[PDB]
Design a protein around this nucleic acid. Structure first.
Ligand SMILES: O=C(CCCCCCCCCO)NCCC/C=C/c1cn([C@H]2C[C@H](O)[C@@H](COP(=O)(O)OP(=O)(O)OP(=O)(O)O)O2)c(=O)[nH]c1=O
Ligand SMILES: [Mg+2]
Ligand SMILES: [Mg+2]
Length: 540
DNA sequence: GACCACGGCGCC
DNA sequence: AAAAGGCGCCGTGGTC
């Protein structure tokens, strides 16, 4: 439709661009175009043409900014219709779906993508006028956050390649030891990686008691929780659990990550997806760096490979009990507020009860266990499941869940309020007004409806915590630039920064204060901060 | 070579 | 597996 005009485009034009592959740090910029005032400008040479733009405005603006940054160009992202659509409805996660929904078609041609970006932005902006709170989130959080994320993606993180390659060789030998024992115990070999073949071995051949079924196909489950119940019915069970631990870590981290070092940066680059979750959280992919191991000894060894540039240090900051503090604010429970105004720690107190140990002797691994419990219970875990994990009678898990909510009355009151509100309006919302539509609150199948309810009332809590962290990132990023430091990773309620050694301590204190005072609530926000040469050492 | 569905599991 | 929620990636099985 647009009249074809010559490159370059006027100021403020919307851009379209086509990449050889989805990851901006690895992509070849195949084509570039821009659209404005009923015209389309198609770049004759896309790389040269990047220099003429002052701002990336259009669909997937951040990705093109990351590519520009990779090429030494400071091209910040600006308006992006995906961010408008994601705020209207977080099920809007792909350019495919957004275009089809708001007036166009995501093609594989840059000129058409540019014209699409223009008309989608006009329509979606029209949808938001009136929606003042979503507008506030777009202007003060999401749009400036996209610029922050582009810098994080282009910066990357340093990885100790030789260390991981050495680790691979050791873990391989240990894996072979375990699988050979498994085959001996089974009486023959098979593909231990195939849960279907393992199902037959355990349940048909060895005649072990089947405990659970899989969700979609109703096969007898071999999940870790099921194997946990059988750890004593037969020795092969334990060997399998250790086998899965090692092969999971080897196949997902040890072996893949070394091959992803970028040739020009010498670092590892993730993508921080900004329109990917139903609650407002970010995600991470290609590779995912929000699920790097930390729990087990081997996992810790892997986390140590994430290191600071020489002359620099990592600074890791992690909000304390974040979603519990958010819950205190959203619900207004007087007793839970006092917990945090008194400085108490629920994860430690639960850990104390769980293991029958005073608070002082609760180790870090014990506190991690208590977090699964505390958040399992809060978001609707059953006594059956809780009794099964804690290895205690059903009646004990029954009671724990009982005491839990009795201690904090207004929580269930807030849950029921949120649900009724969601049933009527069709969506639930965070503190800042980020919405999630949950129509299955009115499903007539009980299991479906109650799952919807657990989704529904989780989202204001998880989501508010996400809004806080996003806002803190937007406030902190310019302060770090000032001190010559870098923002590297976000892990939902944690930030990993890189700072020159001489300024690492000043960076830690500043980032701590920015995170704690981002947006005061009815309770204090506390942040744990550590500094070290590797990701593991940088957490306390 | 690539798609999906699935089970499974790493992290928050 | 289970009346916890939210992600992305692995190998398998089965295609295409
Ligand atoms: O690693 C483990 C298991 C430990 C081993 C226990 C098994 C023993 C078996 C018996 C053998 O004899 N568990 C994982 C612990 C980490 C889980 C985190 C988590 C977080 N969130 C949400 C809620 C939380 O507020 C936020 C941030 O996560 P976080 O930072 O880890 O937790 P939080 O901020 O609340 O606590 P701290 O930061 O530690 O103060 O993310 C959840 O909704 N569910 C979870 O399971
Ligand atoms: Mg935390
Ligand atoms: Mg954390």
């Amino acid at each position: 439709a647009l009249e074809e005009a010559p490159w370059p485009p006027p100021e403020g034009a919307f851009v379209g661009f086509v990449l050889s592959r989805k990851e901006p740090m690895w992509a070849d910029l195949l084509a570039l175009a821009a659209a404005r005032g009923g015209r389309v400008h198609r770049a004759p040479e896309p790389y040269k043409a990047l220099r003429d733009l002052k701002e990336a405005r259009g669909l997937l603006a951040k990705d093109l900014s990351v590519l520009a940054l990779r090429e030494g160009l400071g091209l910040p992202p600006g308006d992006d219709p995906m961010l408008l659509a994601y705020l209207l409805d977080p099920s809007n996660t792909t350019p495919e779906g957004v275009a089809r929904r708001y007036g166009g078609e995501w093609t594989e041609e840059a000129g058409e993508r540019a014209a699409l970006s223009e008309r989608l932005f006009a329509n979606l902006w029209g949808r938001l006028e009136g929606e003042e709170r979503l507008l506030w989130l777009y202007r003060e959080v999401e749009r400036p956050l996209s610029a922050v994320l582009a810098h994080m993606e282009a910066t990357g993180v340093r990885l100790d390649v030789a260390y991981l390659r050495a680790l691979s060789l050791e873990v391989a030998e240990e894996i072979a030891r375990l699988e050979a024992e498994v085959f001996r115990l089974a009486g023959h070999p098979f593909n231990l990686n195939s849960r279907d073949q393992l199902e037959r071995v355990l349940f048909d051949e060895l005649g072990l008691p089947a405990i659970g079924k899989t969700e979609k196909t109703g096969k007898r489950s071999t999940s870790a929780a099921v194997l946990e119940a059988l750890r004593e019915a037969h020795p092969i069970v334990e060997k399998i659990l250790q086998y899965r631990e090692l092969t999971k870590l080897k196949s997902t981290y040890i072996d893949p990550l070394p091959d992803l070092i970028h040739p020009r940066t010498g670092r590892l680059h993730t993508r921080f997806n900004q329109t990917a979750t139903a609650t407002g959280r970010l995600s991470s992919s290609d590779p995912n760096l929000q699920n790097i191991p930390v729990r087990t000894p081997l996992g810790q060894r892997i986390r140590r490979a994430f290191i600071a540039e020489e002359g620099w240090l990592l600074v890791a900051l992690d909000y304390s009990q974040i979603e519990l503090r958010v819950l205190a604010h959203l619900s207004g429970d007087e007793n839970l507020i006092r917990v945090f105004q008194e400085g108490r720690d629920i994860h430690t107190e639960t850990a104390s009860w769980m293991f029958g140990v005073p608070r002082e002797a609760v180790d870090p691994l014990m506190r991690r266990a208590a977090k699964t419990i505390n958040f399992g219970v809060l978001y609707g875990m059953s006594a059956h499941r809780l009794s099964q994990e804690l290895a205690i009678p059903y009646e004990e898990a029954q009671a724990f869940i009982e005491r839990y909510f009795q201690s904090f009355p207004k929580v269930r009151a807030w849950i029921e309020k949120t649900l009724e509100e969601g049933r009527r309006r069709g969506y639930v919302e965070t503190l800042f007004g980020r919405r999630r539509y949950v129509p299955d609150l009115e499903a007539r199948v009980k299991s479906v409806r109650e799952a919807a309810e657990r989704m529904a009332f989780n989202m204001p809590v998880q989501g508010t915590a996400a809004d806080l962290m996003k806002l803190a990132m937007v406030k902190l990023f310019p302060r770090l630039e000032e001190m010559g430091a870098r923002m590297l990773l976000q892990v939902h309620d944690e930030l990993v920064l890189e700072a020159p050694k001489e300024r690492a301590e000043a960076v830690a204190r500043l980032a701590k204060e920015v995170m704690e005072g981002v947006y005061p609530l009815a309770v204090p926000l506390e942040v744990e901060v550590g500094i070290g040469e590797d990701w593991l050492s940088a957490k306390e």
